[PDB]
Amino acid sequence: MDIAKRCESNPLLSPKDLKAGINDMEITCLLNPGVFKFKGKTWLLLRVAERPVQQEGIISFPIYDEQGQIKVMSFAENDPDLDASDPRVIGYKGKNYLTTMSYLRLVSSEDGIHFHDEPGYPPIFGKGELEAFGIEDCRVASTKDGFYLTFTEVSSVAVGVGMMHTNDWKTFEHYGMILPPHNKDCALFEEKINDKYYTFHRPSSPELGGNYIWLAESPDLRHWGNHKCVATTRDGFWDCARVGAGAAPIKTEAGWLEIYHGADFNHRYCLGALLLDLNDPSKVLARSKEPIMEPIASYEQTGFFGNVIFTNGQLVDGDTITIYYGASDEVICKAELSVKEILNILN
């Protein structure tokens, strides 16, 4: 059922391949990159998760303090008030915490396989209360007016969506939190429709709902409204627990092709396909019954919870969709897909 062609060099990047960005921290995970072209080079906007060296029987992680300087929180694994069932997000006396801090980092490549840092292009770190626990999973939308970044803003009070804009990838303009908690997986459409901007997003309901893919429209790109539920999870299927959009949708004659991701209760992530109407993106035309890509490879099965494929960035060259994705929330990888082949399955 997997119709994906991995690059033979996978994994491309690993934690040990790069030097740490935060002082006195190791790199734990490289995952979930945004993808775009600039200066001829192919660029990756990596999510880089860092934390201190872990001592035996102690969970330690960085957080910004009141002064705004990074500090190390520590909890004992055998503490009764600690809940560390999920290694990504932990609880302690009600309040929640991340076990790492993420930031966005640029890497360029001529060939599109060997990536390295570029002098003069420093990383993007979290700023303000709402980005106190870091920023994650950035989608890059290449448009006429420039590059728009839509990413997760994490803090003790919210998992929400922020947006930035850049032309040269050196100066940045921050539009703030565009969608409130609990929301992520924001894929901005790369062109306007009926003189309006559109984006997918993925709010999470404690009750009376779930983790479904939603649509929103905007005139100025800062303010959003007229929300509509696009596609939900499916009981019994591979995408029963949660669904979410990846990168921006691809413009085709059939409709808007969207490579979304879905997972089950074992936290096994796969990729699927959504086809949507051109005039009304909220209306679904076709949807893949089975996943178009699964965590088959060995490096896609080296997780600490489940087997994870996650894409939030891709390039399109006619029929060939070049996707970059995180494998087991640890390493960066590359693969290729066929538009025609996907559309064929959706008939």
Ligand X SMILES: OC[C@H]1O[C@@H](O[C@H]2[C@@H](O)[C@H](O)[C@@H](CO)O[C@@H]2O)[C@@H](O)[C@@H](O)[C@@H]1O
* Contact residues: ligand X, CB under 6 A: 31-32, 88-89, 98, 136-137, 152, 154, 159, 184, 308, 310, 326, 329
Does position 68 interact with a second copy (CB under 8 A)? The reply is no
And the tokens for 308? 């994870």
**Which of 42, 183, 288, 311 contacts a second copy by CB under 8 A?**
183
Least distance to a second copy, CB of residue 85, Å: 12
Least distance to ligand X, CB of residue 344, Å: 29
CA 115 to chain CA mean position, Å: 19
> Which residue's CB comes closest to ligand X?
88
Positive or negative, the Cα torsion across 12, 15, 17, 21?
Answer: positive
Closest CA to 154 of 135, 128, 175: 135
What letter would DSSP give residue 293?
B
Q: Which stretch binds a second copy (CB under 8 A): 109-117, 165-173, 213-221, 252-260?
A: 213-221
And the tokens for 71? 């500090």
Positive or negative, the Cα torsion across 223, 231, 238, 333?
Answer: negative
Least distance to a second copy, CB of residue 161, Å: 9
- Site for a second copy, residues 89 to 118, rule: CB under 8 A: 89, 91, 94, 96, 98
Between 160 and 255, name the residue whose CB sits nearer to ligand X. 160
Between 155 and 288, name the residue whose CB sits nearer to ligand X. 155
Tell me how many degrees the CA angle 271-276-278 measures, rounded to the nearest 5.
Answer: 140
**Which of 220, 236, 279, 347 contacts a second copy by CB under 8 A?**
220
Residue-wise DSSP of 14-48:
-GGGS--SSTT-EEEEEEEEEEEEETTEEEEEEEE
Q: Are 262 and 268 in contact (CB under 8 A)?
A: no
| Cα first-last separation, the chain | 15
- The site that binds a second copy (CB under 8 A) totals a number of residues, namely 50
* 170 burial level (CB within 10 Å; 0-12, 13-18, 19+): exposed
Binding mask 117-136 for a second copy (x = CB under 8 A): ------------xx--x---
Least distance to ligand X, CB of residue 132, Å: 13
Positive or negative, the Cα torsion across 109, 114, 117, 118?
Answer: negative
Least distance to a second copy, CB of residue 94, Å: 7
**Which of 87, 122, 146, 176 contacts a second copy by CB under 8 A?**
176
The rounded distance, in Å, linking the Cα atoms of 314 and 14 is 19
Q: Which does residue 15 touch among a second copy, ligand X, none (CB within 5 to 8 A, set by kind)?
A: none
Does position 84 interact with a second copy (CB under 8 A)? The reply is no
Between 174 and 289, name the residue whose CB sits nearer to a second copy. 174
Cβ atoms within 10 Å of 138's Cβ, excluding its own: 23
Q: Which does residue 152 touch among ligand X, a second copy, none (CB within 5 to 8 A, set by kind)?
A: ligand X
Residue-wise DSSP of 46-100:
EEEEEEPPPPTTEEEEEEE-SSS-EEEEEEETT-TTEE-SSSSEEEETTEEEESS
Least distance to a second copy, CB of residue 216, Å: 7
Does position 212 interact with a second copy (CB under 8 A)? The reply is yes
Q: Where along the sequence are the contacts to a second copy (CB under 8 A)?
A: 89, 91, 94, 96, 98, 129-130, 133, 154-160, 175-183, 201, 203-210, 212, 214, 216-220, 222-229, 232, 235
